[PDB]
């Protein structure tokens, strides 16, 4: 992504000067209208160097977890993961999603069992109310683990939108040593992101830019 490509999307935009985090000073161009302005001169090379690492991970058969819980951007992140055959979390993050992996596996198995059971049959044997209740539980399990049913094991890389909002995820990752790739607004604490991208995390246009560029490079890394 080129600085012009970002700037038109509005990547330079930031939170209010009232709400910023201390470590973000190096990445901040300045202030206008009491608004923090992010410096694309740092943003572009860091994003490119992160894309290099993401391409490397995906080119060694890496499993990638796209992470974002914004109600606006949930579907964008889900489609972003689907466009590169990867795994995602678009619904509210569950604590212990990575650290408590065994419990997630039981939930994954239950979701698989319900969908397999409906295809196999015996829903006729169940009472009509019971069969409908089982379908409702299957829908709830899908709304909870649609993205990670096929992750199989712990992912090899994480992509995070608004790292401050998803702070539990990054704490878990660091506890596991799983690398964190994150779009970091001025209000976030950048310590947890090993490849940090400072940029707007709310705006739909810039978020979609991040996701599309990452997914293009991930498909490229897969293709070899």
Partner 1 sequence: GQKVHPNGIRLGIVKPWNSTWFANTKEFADNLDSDFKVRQYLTKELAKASVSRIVIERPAKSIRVTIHTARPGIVIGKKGEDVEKLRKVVADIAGVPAQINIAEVRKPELDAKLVADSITSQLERRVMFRRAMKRAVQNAMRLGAKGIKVEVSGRLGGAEIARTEWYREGRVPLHTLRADIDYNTSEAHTTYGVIGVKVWIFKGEILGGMA
List interacting residues with partner 1 (CB under 8 A): 122, 125-126
Choosing among Zn ion, partner 1, none, which partner's interface includes residue 172 (Cβ < 5 to 8 Å by kind)?
Answer: none
Task: Calculate helix-pair angle for 204-223, 74-82, nearest 10 degrees.
Answer: 10
Rounded to the nearest angstrom, the gap between the alpha carbon of residue 66 and the centroid of all alpha carbons in its chain is 3
Q: Least distance to partner 1 from the beta carbon of 126, Å?
A: 7
Of 211, 197, 187, residue with least CA distance to 16: 187
Cβ-proximal residue to Zn ion, closest one = 185
Choosing among partner 1, Zn ion, none, which partner's interface includes residue 122 (Cβ < 5 to 8 Å by kind)?
Answer: partner 1
Nearer to Zn ion, 157 or 161 (CB): 161
Alpha-carbon distance of 195 to 133, in angstroms, equals 44
Q: Least distance to partner 1 from the beta carbon of 138, Å?
A: 18
Task: Indicate if the alpha-carbon torsion angle 105, 103, 77, 52 is positive or negative.
Answer: negative
201 binds Zn ion (CB under 5 A): yes
Q: Least distance to Zn ion from the beta carbon of 30, Å?
A: 18
**In this chain, which of 40, 76, 185, 221 binds Zn ion, going by CB under 5 A?**
185
Please enumerate in sequence order all residues whose Cβ is within 8 A of that of 111, keeping only pairs 6 or more positions apart, or say none. Answer: 138, 141, 142, 144, 145, 149
Binding region for Zn ion (CB under 5 A): 162, 185, 201
């Amino acid at each position: 992504v080129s600085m012009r490509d970002m700037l038109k999307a509005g990547v330079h935009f930031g939170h209010q000067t009232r709400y910023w985090n201390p470590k973000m000073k190096p990445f901040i161009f300045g202030a206008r209208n009491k608004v923090h302005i992010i410096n694309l001169e740092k943003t572009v090379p860091m994003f490119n160097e992160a894309l290099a690492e993401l391409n490397k991970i995906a080119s060694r058969k890496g499993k990638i977890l796209f992470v974002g819980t914004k109600r606006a951007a949930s579907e964008a992140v889900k489609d972003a993961a689907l466009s590169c055959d990867q795994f995602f979390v678009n619904h509210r993050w569950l604590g212990g999603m990575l650290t408590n992996w065994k419990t997630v596996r039981q939930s994954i198995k239950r979701l698989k069992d319900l969908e397999t059971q409906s295809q196999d049959g015996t829903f006729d044997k169940l009472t009509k109310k019971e069969a409908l209740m089982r379908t409702r539980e299957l829908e709830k399990l899908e709304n909870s683990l649609g993205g990670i049913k096929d992750m199989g094991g712990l992912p090899d890389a994480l992509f995070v939108i608004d790292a401050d909002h998803e702070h539990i995820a990054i704490k878990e990752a660091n506890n596991l040593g799983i690398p964190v790739f994150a779009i970091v607004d001025t209000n976030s604490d950048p310590d947890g992101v090993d490849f940090v991208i400072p940029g707007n995390d709310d705006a739909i246009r810039a978020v979609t830019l991040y996701l599309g560029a990452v997914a293009a490079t991930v498909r490229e890394g897969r293709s070899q």
